Amino acid sequence: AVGIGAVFLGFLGAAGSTMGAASMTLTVQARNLLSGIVQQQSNLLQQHLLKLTVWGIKQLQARVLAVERYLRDQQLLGIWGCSGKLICCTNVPWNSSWSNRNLSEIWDNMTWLQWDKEISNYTQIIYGLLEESQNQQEKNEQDLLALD
Amino acid sequence: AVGIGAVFLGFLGAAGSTMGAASMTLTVQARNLLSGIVQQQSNLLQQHLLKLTVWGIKQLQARVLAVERYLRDQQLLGIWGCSGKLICCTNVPWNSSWSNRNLSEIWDNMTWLQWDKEISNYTQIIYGLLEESQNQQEKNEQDLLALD
Amino acid sequence: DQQLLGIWGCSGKLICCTNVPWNSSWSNRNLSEIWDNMTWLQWDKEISNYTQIIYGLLEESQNQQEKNEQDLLALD
Amino acid sequence: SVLTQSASVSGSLGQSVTISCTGPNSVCCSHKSISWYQWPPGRAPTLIIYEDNERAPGISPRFSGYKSYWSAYLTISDLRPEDETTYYCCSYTHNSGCVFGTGTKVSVLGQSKANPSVTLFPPSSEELQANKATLVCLISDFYPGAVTVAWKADSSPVKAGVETTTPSKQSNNKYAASSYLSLTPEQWKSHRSYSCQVTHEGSTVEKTVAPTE
Amino acid sequence: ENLWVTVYYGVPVWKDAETTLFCASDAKAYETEKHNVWATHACVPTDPNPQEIHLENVTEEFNMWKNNMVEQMHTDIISLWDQSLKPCVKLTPLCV
Amino acid sequence: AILKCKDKKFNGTGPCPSVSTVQCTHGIKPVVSTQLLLNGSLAEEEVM
Amino acid sequence: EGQLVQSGAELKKPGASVKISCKTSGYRFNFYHINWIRQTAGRGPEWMGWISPYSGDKNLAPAFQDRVIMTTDTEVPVTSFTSTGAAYMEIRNLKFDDTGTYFCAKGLLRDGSSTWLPYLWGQGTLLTVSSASTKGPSVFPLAPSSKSTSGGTAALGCLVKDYFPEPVTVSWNSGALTSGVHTFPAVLQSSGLYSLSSVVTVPSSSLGTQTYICNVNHKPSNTKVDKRVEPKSCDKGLEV
Amino acid sequence: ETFRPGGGDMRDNWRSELYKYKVVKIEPLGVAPTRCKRRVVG
Ligand SMILES: *[C@@H]1O[C@H](CO)[C@@H](O[C@@H]2O[C@H](CO)[C@@H](O[C@@H]3O[C@H](CO[C@H]4O[C@H](CO[C@H]5O[C@H](CO)[C@@H](O)[C@H](O)[C@@H]5O)[C@@H](O)[C@H](O)[C@@H]4O)[C@@H](O)[C@H](O[C@H]4O[C@H](CO)[C@@H](O)[C@H](O)[C@@H]4O[C@H]4O[C@H](CO)[C@@H](O)[C@H](O)[C@@H]4O[C@H]4O[C@H](CO)[C@@H](O)[C@H](O)[C@@H]4O)[C@@H]3O)[C@H](O)[C@H]2NC(C)=O)[C@H](O)[C@H]1NC(C)=O
Ligand SMILES: *[C@@H]1O[C@H](CO)[C@@H](O[C@@H]2O[C@H](CO)[C@@H](O[C@@H]3O[C@H](CO[C@H]4O[C@H](CO[C@H]5O[C@H](CO)[C@@H](O)[C@H](O)[C@@H]5O)[C@@H](O)[C@H](O[C@H]5O[C@H](CO)[C@@H](O)[C@H](O)[C@@H]5O)[C@@H]4O)[C@@H](O)[C@H](O[C@H]4O[C@H](CO)[C@@H](O)[C@H](O)[C@@H]4O)[C@@H]3O)[C@H](O)[C@H]2NC(C)=O)[C@H](O)[C@H]1NC(C)=O
Ligand SMILES: *[C@@H]1O[C@H](CO)[C@@H](O[C@@H]2O[C@H](CO)[C@@H](O[C@@H]3O[C@H](CO)[C@@H](O)[C@H](O)[C@@H]3O)[C@H](O)[C@H]2NC(C)=O)[C@H](O)[C@H]1NC(C)=O
Ligand SMILES: *[C@@H]1O[C@H](CO)[C@@H](O[C@@H]2O[C@H](CO)[C@@H](O[C@@H]3O[C@H](CO)[C@@H](O)[C@H](O)[C@@H]3O)[C@H](O)[C@H]2NC(C)=O)[C@H](O)[C@H]1NC(C)=O
Ligand SMILES: *[C@@H]1O[C@H](CO)[C@@H](O[C@@H]2O[C@H](CO)[C@@H](O[C@@H]3O[C@H](CO)[C@@H](O)[C@H](O)[C@@H]3O)[C@H](O)[C@H]2NC(C)=O)[C@H](O)[C@H]1NC(C)=O
Ligand SMILES: *[C@@H]1O[C@H](CO)[C@@H](O[C@@H]2O[C@H](CO)[C@@H](O)[C@H](O)[C@H]2NC(C)=O)[C@H](O)[C@H]1NC(C)=O
Ligand SMILES: *[C@@H]1O[C@H](CO)[C@@H](O)[C@H](O)[C@H]1NC(C)=O
Numbered sequence A, B: 001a002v003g004i005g006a007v008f009l010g011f012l013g014a015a016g017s018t019m020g021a022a023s024m025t026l027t028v029q030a031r032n033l034l035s036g037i038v039q040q041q042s043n044l045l046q047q048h049l050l051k052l053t054v055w056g057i058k059q060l061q062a063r064v065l066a067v068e069r070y071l072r073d074q075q076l077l078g079i080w081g082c083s084g085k086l087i088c089c090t091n092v093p094w095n096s097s098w099s100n101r102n103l104s105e106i107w108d109n110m111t112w113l114q115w116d117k118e119i120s121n122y123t124q125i126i127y128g129l130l131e132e133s134q135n136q137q138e139k140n141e142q143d144l145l146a147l148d
Numbered sequence C: 001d002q003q004l005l006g007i008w009g010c011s012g013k014l015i016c017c018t019n020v021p022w023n024s025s026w027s028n029r030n031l032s033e034i035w036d037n038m039t040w041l042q043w044d045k046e047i048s049n050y051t052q053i054i055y056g057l058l059e060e061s062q063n064q065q066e067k068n069e070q071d072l073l074a075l076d
Numbered sequence D: 001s002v003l004t005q006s007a008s009v010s011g012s013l014g015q016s017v018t019i020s021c022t023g024p025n026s027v028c029c030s031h032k033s034i035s036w037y038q039w040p041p042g043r044a045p046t047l048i049i050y051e052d053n054e055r056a057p058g059i060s061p062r063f064s065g066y067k068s069y070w071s072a073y074l075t076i077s078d079l080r081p082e083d084e085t086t087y088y089c090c091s092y093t094h095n096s097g098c099v100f101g102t103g104t105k106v107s108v109l110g111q112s113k114a115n116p117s118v119t120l121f122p123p124s125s126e127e128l129q130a131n132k133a134t135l136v137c138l139i140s141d142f143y144p145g146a147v148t149v150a151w152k153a154d155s156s157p158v159k160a161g162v163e164t165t166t167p168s169k170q171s172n173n174k175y176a177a178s179s180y181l182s183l184t185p186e187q188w189k190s191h192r193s194y195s196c197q198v199t200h201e202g203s204t205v206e207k208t209v210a211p212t213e
Numbered sequence E: 001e002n003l004w005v006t007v008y009y010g011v012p013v014w015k016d017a018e019t020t021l022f023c024a025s026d027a028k029a030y031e032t033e034k035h036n037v038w039a040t041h042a043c044v045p046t047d048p049n050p051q052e053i054h055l056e057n058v059t060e061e062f063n064m065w066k067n068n069m070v071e072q073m074h075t076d077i078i079s080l081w082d083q084s085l086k087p088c089v090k091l092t093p094l095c096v
Numbered sequence F: 001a002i003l004k005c006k007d008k009k010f011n012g013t014g015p016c017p018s019v020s021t022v023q024c025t026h027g028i029k030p031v032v033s034t035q036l037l038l039n040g041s042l043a044e045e046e047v048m
Numbered sequence G: 001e002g003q004l005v006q007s008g009a010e011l012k013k014p015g016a017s018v019k020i021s022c023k024t025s026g027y028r029f030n031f032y033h034i035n036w037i038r039q040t041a042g043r044g045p046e047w048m049g050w051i052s053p054y055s056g057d058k059n060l061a062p063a064f065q066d067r068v069i070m071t072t073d074t075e076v077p078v079t080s081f082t083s084t085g086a087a088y089m090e091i092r093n094l095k096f097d098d099t100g101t102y103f104c105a106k107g108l109l110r111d112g113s114s115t116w117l118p119y120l121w122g123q124g125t126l127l128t129v130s131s132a133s134t135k136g137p138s139v140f141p142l143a144p145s146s147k148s149t150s151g152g153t154a155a156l157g158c159l160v161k162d163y164f165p166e167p168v169t170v171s172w173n174s175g176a177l178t179s180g181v182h183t184f185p186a187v188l189q190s191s192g193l194y195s196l197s198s199v200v201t202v203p204s205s206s207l208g209t210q211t212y213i214c215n216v217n218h219k220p221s222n223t224k225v226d227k228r229v230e231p232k233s234c235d236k237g238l239e240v
Numbered sequence H: 001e002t003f004r005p006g007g008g009d010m011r012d013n014w015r016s017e018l019y020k021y022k023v024v025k026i027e028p029l030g031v032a033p034t035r036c037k038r039r040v041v042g
Helices: A019-024 A027-034 A054-080 A113-119 A129-136 A141-145 B019-024 B027-034 B054-080 B113-119 B129-136 B141-145 C002-008 C041-047 C057-064 C069-073 E069-084
Strands: D049-051 D135-137 D139-142 D162-164 D175-177 D179-181 D196-199 D204-207 E004-009 E014-016 E053-055 F019-021 G003-005 G019-021 G023-025 G037-040 G044-047 G075-079 G082-085 G088-090 G142-148 G153-158 G181-183 G198-203 H024-026 H029-034
Touching: A027 A054, A027 B054, A027 B129, A054 A129, A054 B054, B027 B054, B027 C002, B027 C057, B054 B129, B054 E004, B054 E069, B054 H029, B113 H029, C002 C057, G023 G082, G142 G198
Parallel strands: none
Antiparallel strands: D135 D179, D139 D175, D162 D179, D196 D204, E004 H029, E014 H024, E053 F019, G003 G023, G019 G088, G037 G044, G075 G082, G142 G153, G153 G198, G181 G198
């Protein structure tokens, strides 16, 4: 209806804003990602026998896909050492053949969507060892160094 | 049958005990929360064709609701920085218009159920920024301070 | 499974060190004698019987009463 | 009992003195925790502090619990005379009862005075049908609530038959007590009129009933 | 004298829940005859021991009249009958 | 979780002082009966 | 915010034994212990012992170990957050050193030390023991008197003659007049009973639209007679 | 006053032995106030 301007800004409300602005609004995304219970109730908000109407089970397929792609996403975080923590710093340098531009030149200049588009091709290969050189051989260390 | 008194005390066995007592028995709850495999087996513990008896799929609806409400609960912990850790300390002060009473006056005096009842109304509003003022702007800090 | 890790303080971290000693009535052999000598399957087979009982308190003596501590010691 | 308290304590508006009290090694000094009570005589009590320094809710920060190794104290502050009556001390250990005290009453000066109120009731008609009488004439609305009061028929020494009470307090601020005079029938209209003299350190008021009327 | 508000996982706490429940019964092989009315072969077997544990000094409401598990427990019984019947023979050539 | 009540003189509704925790019902046999019940549970009490 | 109420406060002869009790209202009774105390004039406030309503763990005072034997009833729940449950405590002292007023009330956290605290107090029954037996109430009026003829206020009252064991409660119009109404404690005649006075102030113009009725009531002599205070005064000041 | 067995509905058959039982939700997470807090990282 008529626009009300009381709350700011909202889920993906920073998609049209640069990465620096949205980098601060990471949580108005993280809660809306998984929650398939706030919006769908275990029991409803008598002629029918059982509820295998296809409103029933293809709602049912949706709820798990809601979680599993989250659940495998957050496992990637469990691979890289960031489980309960939304941002994550990183040890292996960036050799910039994936992008030649600066630090200001992205957070102030572009947006998140406008950054994936360009390295969408280099995406899989990086995730190869943001754990291996970062975590696979981060903790044989404190294995071999808490050894004493 | 006749009561046997060998094990102590059990799942929610500290619900009738004060918060301090139950605060130590947080794990006899955390394992019984999700485990829908210990009690339900992937294959059973030949005339039938397939098992779409409604024992089959409304058992099936139950298992995911078992996880997703856990999974969204533990995401709230992932929002507040406590993923693998059951208790969690906290930075933003408590202004006590939500409850005027003391520290001893709850853990020794009341129980957990007997504490939610009174602030059940103030529940949603607090969860607004036990992350924002606690974690949303806890790590732009070490973003801006591991900057060097 | 990963909740068990959330019970023992290892959520995002694949290996995990541990505080309560191993009294070795579960296996009498050495440290080299397993990582260099046997394989993982070849280690579960022998303590598959002692499996449940250990998981009783790799949290209690390790984490259930690891953080009433920093409850009672971040108390100040 | 073994514990010993200060017999009396004093101050006024903006006060900060409290009852204190101690005893021997066996009682109330170190290992124990020790927790005391506002006790109006003839009324239930209300409880300031439950364990040394930190106090039960409802009662507010004017009252501070503190003490060292041989006694116990609880310096009240910013005091209005709603505080005026007894606090007794109390030592206990996880397996034992408490031990309560040997008599305290707060009393503070610097307050505005209050005019006493006296009222004589003659000995009514349905009374010497018994035949026994007693004149009573009771005082309220006065503090310091400590006063002496006399008897007299015909301004000439009478010397048999008067009681008068301990004062007991239930008003918001002020105080009362009671007094009266026992009988032998005629001796009285042997007189001409009466007296219930109320004497304060500030002023002396006297009422007189002419019982011919 | 400063107070923080800190969280805990696994507090003994509960709410009047509306949700769908399931059946568990120790399985009878019973290879002589087959096909029970309700249990059939789909109900899961009860665990060797179901654990019963006393909640001490706990007092909690109970109203068996707007209780829902009955409206469920007959919602079932009507239902699967109408699927224990459907595979069986249809008797309309008999209204002769 | 389900939960059971455990005082014998409990009547139809009210809070139960004696409570113990179950997750799965005791063995209920669905007897199809009208106006009477039988082969059911039996309280150690005087039928209130 | 829970109320606790004992019952009566009356007479007894040295030999026998009477028991007094004290029941919760508005909160749970069981997981909070029991206690009773005295504050006799001779020995001041004094504590005796507890037990637990749940299992029963007593710890009495050496002064009153060998005389006093007591039991308490069971739960009566009100709802998940409030209950009731009885608790009955018998005496046996045969000494008037104990003549005073008897409370019994409780209130605490319960998992720390300080593990008994009396907090939310009962009526305080008043244990009068006597060798003299019960003497019952009679009652006659107090003529109105002038309080301030400038302000137009008067004071009229009621009888409260000598009677044996106090207390003795007296309401007027049976409840609906509590503003300004004032009564005071009794005295002690040298032969051994009480007396006080009863007076309340009202506006002098209130004589023909309101009824004033004091009501005398001592329970152990089970007598209670109600009166009509005659509003016609004899005070010249009030007569103006 | 008179009266008579009715059996108007059957689920009274279910109230027969489903009256001990009552299902209930798990709300397993509670916030509560204590004095602990880990290092303010600033
Ligand atoms: C209150 O509580 C009371 C206490 O329990 C309840 O009392 C119960 O009442 C029910 C009836 O409502 C009884 O069920 C029936 O009991 C019959 C009597 O049992 C006697 O025999 C027992 C030993 O034999 C049984 O057990 C063996 C295994 O050990 C089994 O092989 C054998 O077949 C038989 O079942 C003995 O121990 C007892 O003490 C008794 O003396 C029993 O015969 C009934 O079995 C029938 O009926 C049922 C119901 O349909 C079928 O499911 C069975 O398969 C069986 O039917 C088959 O055999 C018939 C024999 O003639 C054939 O006519 C049928 O067509 C069928 O045969 C076909 O299928 C076979 C298998 O595929 C093939 O081999 C054939 O060739 C055919 O194709 C049944 O069990 C309870 O027993 C009784 N309780 C007790 C403890 O006894 C009371 O009911 C309760 N109240 C209420 C309201 O519920
Ligand atoms: C259901 O309801 C019940 C009650 O309604 C509830 O039980 C309460 O639980 C709390 C929590 O634990 C208890 O609080 C503790 O109580 C300890 C018991 O006090 C000791 O001392 C008693 C008195 O002894 C005196 O009297 C004897 C003569 O009788 C004399 O000779 C002695 O010298 C002494 O002066 C004694 O009776 C009592 O014995 C009972 O308890 C022991 C266990 O300790 C048991 O073995 C016995 O068989 C008997 O049942 C006991 O020995 C008290 O010590 C304790 O204080 C310690 O711990 C705190 C921390 O809590 C420390 O800070 C402190 O420094 C002490 O080290 C604490 O006060 C409470 O007493 C229970 N009973 C009540 C309230 O009546 C159940 O829990 C409820 N159900 C659930 C699920 O909670
Ligand atoms: C992301 O990575 C992919 C893979 O390297 C890049 O795709 C490639 O882009 C080049 C254009 O520079 C394409 O080359 C062209 O080939 C034709 C002959 O087929 C030639 O005539 C043209 O002159 C040109 O060289 C190449 O085909 C293409 N390959 C694939 C698999 O897509 C893409 O450019 C990268 N995107 C960004 C934004 O970096
Ligand atoms: C939890 O928070 C809610 C919301 O503030 C509280 O509910 C409110 O409680 C008050 C009672 O103090 C209700 O006010 C009443 O309104 C009527 C008129 O409708 C008035 O006549 C009464 O005198 C009284 O003022 C109010 O309606 C109610 N509002 C809602 C939405 O429930 C509740 O009290 C809080 N609970 C606790 C335990 O703190
Ligand atoms: C894992 O733990 C189980 C449980 O302790 C071990 O099983 C036990 O193994 C012994 C063999 O040393 C069996 O004892 C035998 O009993 C018969 C009589 O029944 C006796 O005649 C034999 O001489 C022998 O003593 C015992 O029955 C068996 N118990 C169970 C429940 O399996 C098992 O050996 C352990 N495995 C490893 C690799 O440590
Ligand atoms: C019928 O009722 C009896 C109890 O009255 C149930 O239990 C039986 O009790 C008798 C003695 O009272 C024993 O001799 C039997 O062995 C018991 N039987 C069983 C199976 O436990 C009996 O179960 C009831 N019959 C049913 C439920 O079919
Ligand atoms: C105890 O309760 C009162 C009630 O407001 C509170 O003021 C006091 O500070 C509490 N004690 C502590 C240590 O906070």
